[PDB]
Amino acid sequence: EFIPTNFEILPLEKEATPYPALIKDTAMSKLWFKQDDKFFLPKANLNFEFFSPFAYVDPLHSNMAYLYLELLKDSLNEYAYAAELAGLSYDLQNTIYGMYLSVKGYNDKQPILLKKIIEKMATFEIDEKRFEIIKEAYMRSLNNFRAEQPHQHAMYYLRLLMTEVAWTKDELKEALDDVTLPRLKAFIPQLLSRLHIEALLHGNITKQAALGIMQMVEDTLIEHAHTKPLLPSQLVRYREVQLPDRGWFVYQQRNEVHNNSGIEIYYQTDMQSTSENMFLELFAQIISEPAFNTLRTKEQLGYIVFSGPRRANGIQGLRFIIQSEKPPHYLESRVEAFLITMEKSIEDMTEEAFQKHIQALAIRRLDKPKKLSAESAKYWGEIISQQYNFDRDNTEVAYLKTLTKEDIIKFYKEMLAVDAPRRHKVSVHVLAREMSQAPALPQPEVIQNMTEFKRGLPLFPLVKPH
Amino acid sequence: EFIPTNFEILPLEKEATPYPALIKDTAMSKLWFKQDDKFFLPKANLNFEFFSPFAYVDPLHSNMAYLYLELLKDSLNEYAYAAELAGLSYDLQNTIYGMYLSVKGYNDKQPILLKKIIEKMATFEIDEKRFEIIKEAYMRSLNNFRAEQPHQHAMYYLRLLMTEVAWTKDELKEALDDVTLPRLKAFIPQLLSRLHIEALLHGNITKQAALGIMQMVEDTLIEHAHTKPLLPSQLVRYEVQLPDRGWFVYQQRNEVHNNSGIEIYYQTDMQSTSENMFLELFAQIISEPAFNTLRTKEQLGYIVFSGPRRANGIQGLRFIIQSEKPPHYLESRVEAFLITMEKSIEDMTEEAFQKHIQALAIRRLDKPKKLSAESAKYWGEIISQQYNFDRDNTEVAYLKTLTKEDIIKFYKEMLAVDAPRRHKVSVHVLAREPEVIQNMTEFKRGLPLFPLVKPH
Fold first, then answer.
1. What is the DSSP code string of B204-215?
2. Which B residues 413-452 touch A at CB under 8 Å?
3. Is A423 helix (H, G, I), strand (E, B) or coil?
4. Does residue A27 sit at the B interface (CB-CB below 8 Å)?
5. Interface test with B, best of A171, A459, A466 (most B CBs within 10 A)
6. Residue B339's CB: how many other CB atoms inside 10 A?
7. Which of B86, B91, B181, B434 could pair covalently with B102 via S-S, beta carbons 3.0-4.6 A apart?
8. Chain A environment of B454 (Cβ under 8 Å)
């Protein structure tokens, strides 16, 4: 049971800052917490950082850690049934950085069960049959994936063609052929040998108790396996690749089962600066309603048609989760027809189209939280991109006050055109199971050695900091 | 166990190429192969790299690999005194990519002896305390490493700020406390289950016998520890993007030596035939007026030197200068010599131009002397994966294309004070006692990176 009656709403201190602040920082600690204002709730929601370098280095050890988390969160759920049944949810989630931890819920037993979870995942024991059955279950799950939907597997190539490295399912499939339990079983404390944990906290709790809870969990883990602090010289992030400034490249993927031919486009404006956010979103909104009016509705190229944003490596962009049975080059020509449509529509965006358009994106943008976790996921998105300007949305409003009609001339010429000298266009064909003005397009290449493809190209700058 | 007896030399067959040829490539093996046409000597020298992803793992894994090879080469040396007594030598050396193997001497019984070497380093037992003495010895060595020369530490800067990532000696310092013997003793089969060996063979040697020898050796390797191959993207490579005009520097005061170190670096590019003769000719064309005035006339310190950088398949420009001076003061002197060459090259007429490009030619022009020197240049061809064995005549013919105006084109685009390709950067070292660089984290925080070189 563990006493949930301690629900008295804590009044905010003299330290009244409008956001979670870096209230505790050491070589191990980095602590972030503001409490409830719009809700005044007994719950609290929690967001927790894990990093290991080993979580990006091997398909073998990734499968290891993946199934490790599987049998692990599998285990204490027999305990945690009643507690989360007592309205105390939590999350263990694989990332490319490592795992992901997040806890939500009432202030019944939060530091206590918190500590129980920390100790439990800190020291855990393994059964060989349960090991091998979990192994075989996800083994049969692996080769299930080889026939996904073209838009789903297209999203896989989306996550695959926008990174530093991502190991394939074939990389995983040869890798499970040699897996033993003593291997990862010895490897796990080597796996967890050095970490930094950043803690995002929120709700009906105390600053000084949050300091003690942070010191608690770090001292607990040092007690377990003496996980030493990480290095700033090894906390690395990975970049998105630079095109040869007009070279747009593409390749094809003949599907096996589905006779629809998939294709999806992507672009690179710049970082989330003042200008480019509203550029991409407002542009996304002006390819929402007239394009939904025209291409999907008026042309009916196919059933699966999408047009929307795509944020990779802390860089936004523009995706089109569109699937039909067309010649994809012909469908590109349709796309180019839509680009000429937008060419005519630059001046044809009137005063009213602009005003309704900016106010609808503003209402899209402006939204107070309805949950204590609603803003927290978005804050977590700033966290995983290391941003922390929690009023950069106010900066977004200030730039939404700043776009002119002349800007989209400026945005089109060097960025959006075909003769665009700063053109960063991406497309990929995903072919089938069997598969009014034509501009002078430069013939793109075929992409065979993806290793040699992404081998020689540059990358993108990080932040002049805030 | 071995004496060389094959000295009746084997004549050169149908293969009419004068170079190391890639005759075999599997998922594990890749055999660039040559036979002897110059000197007809019964020695055969061997070159083998041991790439591993486990290279950049830790400063702990650095010392693992390092001290592993160290004691490892020390251990079989107890076996290898008959070979040392035979005068038939070898090499084991680490890389920031992995390890390196050389085998040298006569072509008779190198495969079988080599197989013994491979088998013993694969099946190797570990002594506890002997290792501890070695551990403490390299500990005291790293303790001594903080008291080394600023020019030696300047070359350490050359390996330092010119990568994607490295480890520091302080990182190396605390991690020696973390060393246990079962850690690496269990990490060796962790190590040896996946790494790479590219094969290079050269000598009075046949083809199919060499195929069988290399296949035998890798078969033994897979027999013991089952070394599974890599992905080609798993052979990835480590350099800092510039703003291309802004000049950057930091100081790191010395502890022991009272002299101050300084150097200004300039990356041009890859080793394109353009940038090769740019760098070489420009470096040597400033070298002799430097010998005229800065070294001889000024006499600031004795350790004053200028040279090129050739690493990562990437060119560079160095100035080995160690002397206790005020920093900006010596900066202004080097700047003054930049002005000196700016006028002096324009002052150099066609005569010294032609004699000096002839000097660079005869620098470049030298006949083979042994397999070792050509093989060292071959190894440089290997490590950046370029193999251009006939860039000699090519870069010479390119050298003929450079005029007095052509080098001015090389000046003002890149080397002017307002040049947009001003690749200017420095590192200060103080005594034993623009803008500033905040952090090395800030040094590698906000950056693009480079296109990579097409391999061969």
1. S--SHHHHHHHH
2. 439-441, 445-452
3. coil
4. no
5. A459
6. 11
7. B91
8. 456
